[PDB]
Amino acid sequence: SDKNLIETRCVLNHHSTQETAIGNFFSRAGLVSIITMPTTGTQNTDGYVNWDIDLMGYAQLRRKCELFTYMRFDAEFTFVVAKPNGELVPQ
Amino acid sequence: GDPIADMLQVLPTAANTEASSDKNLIETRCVLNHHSTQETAIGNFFSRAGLVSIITMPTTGTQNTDGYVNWDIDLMGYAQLRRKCELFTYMRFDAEFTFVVAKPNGELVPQLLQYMYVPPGAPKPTSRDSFAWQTATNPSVFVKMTDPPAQVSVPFMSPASAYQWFYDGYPTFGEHLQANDLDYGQCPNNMMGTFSIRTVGTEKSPHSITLRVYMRIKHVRAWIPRPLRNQPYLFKTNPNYKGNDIKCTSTSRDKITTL
Amino acid sequence: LLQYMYVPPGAPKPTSRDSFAWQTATNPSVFVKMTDPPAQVSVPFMSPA
Amino acid sequence: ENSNSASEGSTINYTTINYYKDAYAASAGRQDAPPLKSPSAEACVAQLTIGNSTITTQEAANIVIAYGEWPEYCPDTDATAVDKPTRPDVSVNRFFTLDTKSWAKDSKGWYWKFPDVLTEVGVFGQNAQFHYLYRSGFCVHVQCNASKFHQGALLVAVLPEYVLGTIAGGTGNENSHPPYATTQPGQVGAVLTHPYVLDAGIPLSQLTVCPHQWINLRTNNCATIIVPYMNTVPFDSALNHCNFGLLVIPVVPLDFNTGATSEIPITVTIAPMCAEFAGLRQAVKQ
Amino acid sequence: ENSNSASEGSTINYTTINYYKDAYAASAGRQDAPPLKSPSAEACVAQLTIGNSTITTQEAANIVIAYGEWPEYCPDTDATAVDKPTRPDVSVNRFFTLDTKSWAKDSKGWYWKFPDVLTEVGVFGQNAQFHYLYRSGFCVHVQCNASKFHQGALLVAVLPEYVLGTIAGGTGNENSHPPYATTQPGQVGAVLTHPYVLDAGIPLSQLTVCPHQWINLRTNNCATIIVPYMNTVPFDSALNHCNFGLLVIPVVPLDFNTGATSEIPITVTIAPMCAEFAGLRQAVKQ
Amino acid sequence: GIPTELKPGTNQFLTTDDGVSAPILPGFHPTPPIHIPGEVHNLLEICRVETILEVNNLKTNETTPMQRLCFPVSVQSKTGELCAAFRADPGRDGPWQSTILGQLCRYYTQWSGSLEVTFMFAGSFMATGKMLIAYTPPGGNVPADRITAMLGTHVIWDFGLQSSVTLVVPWISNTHYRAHARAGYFDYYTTGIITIWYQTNYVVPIGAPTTAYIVALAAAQDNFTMKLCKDTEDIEQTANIQ
Amino acid sequence: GIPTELKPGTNQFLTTDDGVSAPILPGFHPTPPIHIPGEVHNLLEICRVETILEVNNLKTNETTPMQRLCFPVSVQSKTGELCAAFRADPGRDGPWQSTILGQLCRYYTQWSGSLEVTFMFAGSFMATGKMLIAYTPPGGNVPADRITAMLGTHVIWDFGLQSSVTLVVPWISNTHYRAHARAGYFDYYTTGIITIWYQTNYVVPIGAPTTAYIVALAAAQDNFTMKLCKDTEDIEQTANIQ
Amino acid sequence: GIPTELKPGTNQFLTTDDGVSAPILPGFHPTPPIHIPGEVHNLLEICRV
Amino acid sequence: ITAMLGTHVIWDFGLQSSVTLVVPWISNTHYRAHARAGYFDYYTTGII
Ligand SMILES: CCCCCCCCCCCCCCCCCC(=O)O
Ligand SMILES: CCCCCCCCCCCCCCCCCC(=O)O
Ligand SMILES: [Cl-]
Ligand SMILES: [Cl-]
Ligand SMILES: [Cl-]
Ligand SMILES: [Cl-]
Ligand SMILES: [K+]
């Protein structure tokens, strides 16, 4: 429509639209849960936790998903575990 | 009908010598020269990983003692790779970044880390716990210091057709008063954003961490050769040199008639 | 963590654990841990002869 | 596989290895007159006429075509801005002569920046100021006459993206920067303070790796270099960015016996070639 | 390989990698008027007649077809309930006019929920109450007359799954919830308390990304939107679930000079299209 | 076994790595998909839909945010007046932030293409007049007056005759793509400026309001694309979401 | 899973290893390339371009470095005088260091091929004379006099008639390649010596300078190649680059 | 990734193992061989002298 | 620097003893009456 309100030249535009395909927009792993099992304290101090699966607790992934009303997909879950300061032990 | 009339330079092997430019000023023999020119292809010259950054997260001191660092991506802080790149004016390439991490003395401990690429305009982490580490869109790498060095491929990301080591101009219009001369030579098309790193934990890690980043140029194209740097580098963003000690490009001797 | 660097004739040699030569922007280097299996590389026939 | 490699779109074919859907993740692999030696017009009284102006040289084997490429308008495949450009032609692609410099026995050398030299000259200047986007090549002609008893040699070269540096306070401790009048001196050009390092920490001795020509007084009195547009973008601001610098440096100092004419000038005459502009609005000087 | 990928059954073909017997274990791979710009009836005195009722518009290029899809009965390939549905036709697919709203210079805006608006109206209402399962599309017609001296602009939009939120006690500390009369106000509709965020923490400024039409008093006096059935299931309860909300918001406030008629009403007339019901039993109101 | 050598990258978890993972449920088949209206495949489809621009984004109306959705036009006593001005950078802070184009732009680092700004006059049928809408490419600041603004790309709109007009902001850039402009070096990527001036005057007969409003909407044209997916600055998390 | 055995080399990071790495941005497409003049594919293209040789590399002119770029020739009172001498080793410390050929040579361990040294006389048109330029293959030191130097490869140049002459230093070596020569065992690789002598005399009429200068340039011929890429000695880093 | 299982022998360095190793110099080409009298291919040639 | 904006030729009298400047016919009218001070200056050809 440029070539409608202004005089235009010819531009052989080969800029790709692939990166905005919803698959590339969404297929990036994002944080959806942080579960803790401390040894001291008043919660989950017994070495086990039952976490009700609810993926709406972290703003970034939530807002992207909420751009749509309905979404159908498979999901890859990755479990990054460590002690509270990031150290790893043979557990 | 018309009212107005006015309206490859280097081949795979070295040139042979034919029996009688040598064979022009002297008598020559025939030499079937099959010496290869491949090793001087720019790809082989450049596709060797070199140090481009050393990031530290000490536990004691007055800098980056909070277990996270936002490193503004600027690859001109190490002389070797810089001089090679500056042999050209423009270069286009993909890059392989390798992250060699250890404690200050080279020892390794079981420590989990996160490296996140924060493109220009993405929110930067402001603490070890910032929401930005959720990394729902930015690419992140979680790796242990005991794992082999992390490694990823970064594509050619400039808004322009090539990165440019020399930009003779200013990024914007305006008066260019003395107070803003730092602007001179600043090309935003090379500004790739931030590289953010943290120890993964809400509690502070007891380990001082040193990260050495290596970059290997690949799928490279280069344009416009230029004279090679002959003065020590002083700053990352300009070609300033020490005026009181201008180095001669060649070593000296006593007389032009004796070796 | 260790670094092994091949310094061909004429390349500047490291003069300390921190020398600029360890930047290894052109020379080939191998970074390996003492707990990793032995490092291993192929070196071609390099003589001028 | 996505064809998103940095080498995608080049004439050279590489054999690489890949395990991912993105081409740039692949290994570097292996591949499978001269443009840099300042090609003469022939390798690729004479009179070059352009617009309403004519200069007079002698031979076509004496005209250097930088990087072996003749100036051209931006092709549609490389263009990005969508408005129709204005190509004023004869009013801008013609010869403009700048202030003459005086060559002395102790002169250091001079430089001019392009297109800065003409942003305030003629119809070219006006177009450069009225439009955001500019683009063009240049025919650079340097003139210097002297007698058969004078001697000296000027190296005339075109250095793309000629970024200047400072002496860093002499000691190297001061991160000072070249001021505006030094980076874009305009029509009058500027003088080099350390020609040996081109005021930029690089050797004058290697400047011949750039398009150039010598003006050796005993053989010639002029140098002509044709320069194509060079940049990482197809059009750019004529005000904010200088695509290249012209360097005229006396590598062999001027000399002559007392009594021979001592006023030996150097004159620069330049003609934009294929100049085009886009992104029209009000006139902006800087 | 088991064909159990989430993308199985779509028109787009992806090239993925897999090492397991289940297709969903595979990598995402790579792929290998406009439905969203509110397509007019043409892009896909006038009179729309349905059942024993007729409204009068002007142009077919003035009727929006939401997402470019005309209402239809559920196809056998998508159906799951096995009983034969009842499709009463003319007794339910006809125009029903709700209570009229009064547009004032300071009105915030209104919303209605579908099919809630008609669950107690006519034969449609009865069928909605006697059956567990319901399904249909709708022709939504909003009317507003004013003189050539009045001014104002209403944005009339259809927001599928219009979930309302609360002000969380003002401070944001209270996890309060909208009461039943607010989520399903029935025939009379309800008023927005914070139209700027649609009483749901999302911008009214982007509501045009949904099927909509403007009623700009100086140009038109009515808006007509045809809405297809939208849900993640082929049939659903007309009582427990509202498939979409109708929003009528004065983005440009009503204005006129003193003495001009100040009683400017807004009337909503809607017709179920292709309404069908299943799972018959006794009448249930909620 | 087969001779192998582990390479750098081993054991790392790269969030954007598109690999294969072991399926937790053998022989599982999902509920089949049913037809649902409104499927989208590429975010560009959304970027091409016009949404409202908060041109009237004043500090003084933050507490009555609805007023940000339209701006005033009225009878002028002095000719050639400036009615409104704003930058044309889609991903920059300001009026474009309220559009869905602007918000999706923030999930990417770079963009390219022509944009469209539609102005809808919502005064009375009896009000008439002409405005000059200009797009000034990069170079200076807001044109000081109409006779300067008219030197750039522009359209003259008669809102008496047509209630809506569309100004096309053609892609005029040095680079093929622009990173999002902002103060500092990145101003190198600014798109330019949009200004709307009175060409004649807003005129009315007796009996009609002397002030009316215009709603401005923006969207991308078909040649618009985005590049280098990234996280947005427009959503944060300072506390737990409960 | 498939039986495998990890081999030595596992987990190591070899800087020159040309492998594949996970791409951080799925579906990303770069700004297309546009045509740019001056693309180079092989460093040899640069090695063949002549650059200035600092033959006059004296300790006494380090503070006026420009004087290193040319050397003097003048009226002689004694015949057969030596005008200048220097080694022909392209990668060795000395005159060749100022050439781009010399600097690129330093990024490699070995070289092979013929070289070219061009001499440009920049005296007046009225000055004339002949010089004998010789290339002495390995064996001794700088020839003691012209009658000894003329026994080697040489060209007689009349700078009156032609301002420039090119001396070809043909590849004359025992080995197919030479590592860079330097004092000690590596002198085994020396290329030899270049000397320029007065064949007749530098002569001028009354009115012209009795001293003039010659600029010497060097480049590689088409049969020149380099081998075994390595880091150069000509750039270091003693402190942070800020 | 592809399912694999490390077997006994993993990480060991067997001196007579004839494997492949990463080349330290990409694109490197050796000095060509020239004819030299006296090449031998098998030690038995010497045992027969 | 002002004169060079017009029609011009650069002459090297060292290399060539004679040069010819062409004064091309550039006029509004097809013919010119002879110019002189006053209204007839309308017909002036210009300056060399
Ligand atoms: C063997 C360990 C694997 C267990 C991984 C956890 C699996 C959790 C179920 C995955 C459900 C994904 C769909 C989420 C839909 C969003 C629901 C919501 O949060 O509102
Ligand atoms: C997931 C972790 C990956 C992050 C790696 C860091 C990525 C940094 C961006 C790469 C940009 C390469 C181009 C550099 C151009 C030179 C710019 C300059 O320094 O002037
Ligand atoms: Cl976290
Ligand atoms: Cl180091
Ligand atoms: Cl300085
Ligand atoms: Cl509420
Ligand atoms: K050959």
Numbering used by the authors:
A (entry chain A): 59 to 149
B (entry chain A): 1 to 7, 23 to 35, 59 to 297
C (entry chain A): 150 to 198
D (entry chain B), E (entry chain B): 14 to 45, 65 to 76, 82 to 323
F (entry chain C), G (entry chain C): 1 to 242
H (entry chain C): 1 to 49
I (entry chain C): 147 to 194
Q: What's the publication's text?
A:
Enterovirus 71 (EV71) and coxsackievirus A16 (CVA16) are subgroup A human enteroviruses (HEVA), small, nonenveloped single-stranded RNA (ssRNA) viruses whose protective capsid mediates cell entry and humoral immune responses. Here, we remedy this with high resolution X-ray structures of both mature and natural empty CVA16 particles and also of empty recombinant viruslike particles of CVA16 produced in insect cells, a potential vaccine antigen.
VLPs were secreted from Sf9 insect cells infected with recombinant baculovirus containing the P1 and 3CD genes of CVA16 (09-7 strain) and purified by ultracentrifugation. Crystals of CVA16 VLPs diffracted to 2.5 Å. The space group of CVA16 VLP crystals is P4232, with unit cell dimensions of: a = b = c = 347 Å. The recombinant CVA16 capsid is self-assembled from VP0, VP1, and VP3. As expected, the residues lining the inner surface of the particle show more disorder; indeed, they seem a little more disordered than those of the natural empty particle. Residues 65 to 76 of VP0, which include the cleavage site between 69 and 70 (cleavage of which produces VP4 and VP2) are well defined in the density. The pocket factor binding site located inside the β-barrel of VP1 is fully occupied by a fatty acid acquired from the Sf9 insect cells, which differs somewhat from that derived from mammalian cells and is modeled as stearic acid.
